[PDB]
Design a protein around this ligand. Structure first.
Ligand SMILES: Nc1ncnc2c1ncn2[C@@H]1O[C@H](COP(=O)(O)OP(=O)(O)OP(=O)(O)O)[C@@H](O)[C@H]1O
Ligand SMILES: [Hg+2]
Length: 194
């Protein structure tokens, strides 16, 4: 198996930014939001079950998200259908990779208990004030942050941490360096598996 690095981080923390520096090195990426997308694509068996349950009225993703919001009840139904499907499709894509290591980007890696799927956890860390600043509404982001794990909790889960609080203009070169150092370390971790 590819060595698998789960990348996560709270809303607005810079997961995409960091994932991009790894894909710049030619490292493959399995992205949870992309997979979640594939799973309900136009002609897909999941989609057609969603449509039977909700109506053609919905894929209009905004319409479906809208519907979920009603109460935990339809959300439960959808999660019972999609979460296991997304998980399996993730496993598939990861097992298909033949690079020495793969970056597995998952916004809810901890919260949805997908930590068993990766070898090691990379967190992009920033303060809550940074999350709010970068994500800019203030009200809406805060509720998202309330439903995600705390900074401390995310950090206790992390094997590696890259800090993204400083602005890119000044800190990008140090961010790049830290990614090159992790890159070299992950290749070594992949070799050690053999
Ligand atoms: N260190 C940086 N300095 C200034 N802006 C940054 C920095 N890092 C990322 N950003 C910007 O902050 C925003 C959030 O970054 P990014 O998309 O990488 O985070 P994310 O964790 O993937 O976001 P989300 O989960 O909320 O979609 C983007 O607008 C991005 O361009
Ligand atoms: Hg992991």
């Amino acid at each position: 198996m590819t060595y698998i690095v789960g990348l996560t981080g709270g809303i607005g923390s810079g997961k995409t930014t960091i994932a991009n520096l790894f894909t710049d090195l030619g490292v493959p990426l399995v992205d949870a939001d992309v997979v979640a997308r594939e799973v309900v694509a136009k002609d897909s068996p999941l989609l057609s079950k969603i449509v039977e349950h909700f109506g053609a009225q919905i894929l209009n993703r905004a319409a479906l998200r809208e519907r979920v919001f009603n109460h935990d009840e339809d959300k439960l139904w959808l999660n019972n259908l999609l979460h296991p499907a997304i998980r399996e499709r993730m496993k598939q894509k990861l097992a298909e990779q033949t690079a020495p290591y793969t970056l597995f980007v998952v916004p809810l890696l901890i919260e949805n208990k997908l930590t068993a799927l990766c070898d090691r956890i990379l967190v992009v860390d920033v303060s809550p004030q940074t999350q709010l600043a970068r994500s800019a509404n203030f009200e809406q982001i805060q509720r998202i942050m309330n439903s995600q794990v705390s900074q401390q909790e995310r950090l206790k889960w992390a094997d590696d941490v890259i800090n993204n609080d400083a602005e890119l203009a000044q800190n990008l070169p140090h961010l790049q360096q830290k990614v090159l150092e992790l890159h070299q370390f992950y290749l070594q971790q992949a070799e050690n598996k053999n």
